[PDB]
């Protein structure tokens, strides 16, 4: 079980990683197997609460969403050794949806044609000795899958 492989380089919240696990901390809240999924990304301490059913916010709507029927748990520890997040998006993200596109966000009537400027902004915004709330908090989420078939855990 490569649980030590999950906990040098991490991925941003907008590009969160999921890993297929089979046949094997400041915040720890459980809510709820054939399959278990390891979600690893990073958000600041303010947005840790976004990883929960019944959520609203920049991370919840446009970066990472929980299915409101979560049968799993959320793991996270303190300040991070070594980050992007999606700020501009037209619609809310679906549960477990991942958005990679870097297309210029069109906030006006005229289109952008890939050029940043008036009413045309990059959807992704860049994230020591500051408030720990705004310091990165690595977040690990485990999703449990249970269907009518042989289990693998």
């Amino acid at each position, epitope marked *: 079980c490569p649980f030590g492989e999950v906990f040098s380089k991490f991925a941003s919240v907008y590009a969160w990683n999921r890993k297929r696990i089979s046949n094997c901390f400041s915040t720890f809240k459980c809510y709820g197997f054939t399959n278990v999924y390891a979600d690893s990304f990073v958000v600041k301490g*303010d947005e840790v609460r976004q990883i929960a059913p019944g959520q*609203t*916010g*920049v991370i919840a*709507d*446009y970066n990472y969403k929980l299915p409101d029927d979560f049968t799993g748990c959320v793991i996270a520890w303190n300040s991070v050794k070594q980050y992007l997040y999606r*700020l*501009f*998006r*037209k*619609s*809310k993200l679906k549960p477990f949806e991942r958005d990679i596109s870097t297309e210029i*966000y*069109q*906030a*006006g*009537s005229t289109p952008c044609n890939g050029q940043v400027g*008036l*009413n045309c*902004y990059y959807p992704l*915004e860049r994230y020591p000795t*500051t*408030g720990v*709330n*705004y310091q990165p908090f690595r977040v690990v989420v485990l999703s449990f899958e249970l269907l009518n078939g042989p289990a693998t855990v």
Partner: antibody
Amino acid sequence: EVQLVESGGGLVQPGGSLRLSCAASGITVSSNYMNWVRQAPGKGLEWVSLIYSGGSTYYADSVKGRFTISRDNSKNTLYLQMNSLRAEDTAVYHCARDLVVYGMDVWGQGTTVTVSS
Amino acid sequence: EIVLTQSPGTLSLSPGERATLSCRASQSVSSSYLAWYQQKPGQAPRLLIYGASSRATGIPDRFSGSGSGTDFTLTISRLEPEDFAVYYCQQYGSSPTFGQGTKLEIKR
């Protein structure tokens, strides 16, 4: 072309209801963070409501359970439904485009709301 | 929540002087969520500085932002006669909040 115009303000007795209209041109209401910021006579700017591009709506503690903010795609108009209007709500209401990191760059002249019997 | 306090209530200077505007944050806060606004009488607020020291488009270079942590400073290097207005500082968190504002009057 890029401009915000407010309308719908008027005279409302205490405990009444009123709805404000913020017509937008040049910018799309549904694609931007929309904010309502009011200013009491002789006082400073006070944030009121916030609607996300994805539909999430945020409100201040003093306006919780009383104020609701909506929008119209077909009209490109931002709405703010106000209920249980106390004397605190006598102010001029502006609608502004909110770039979160980049601040609020576009502001309208606003409309006037007075709460008095 | 985030509370912003501006000091002092009224700043009294004369044209050609340097204005040091202070906005105090009761808690340590991000340096990219602060905006400085100028509001002349009978007009809508105008954004001057976003983030911490970034000027908005069309803002004259005499306006300068600074500060980090809990203390931030808005600086006008040379005061033009039409720079006398009320200046506000803003922070966001989850819901935007504003300070009470500082009035710039003419020294006499």
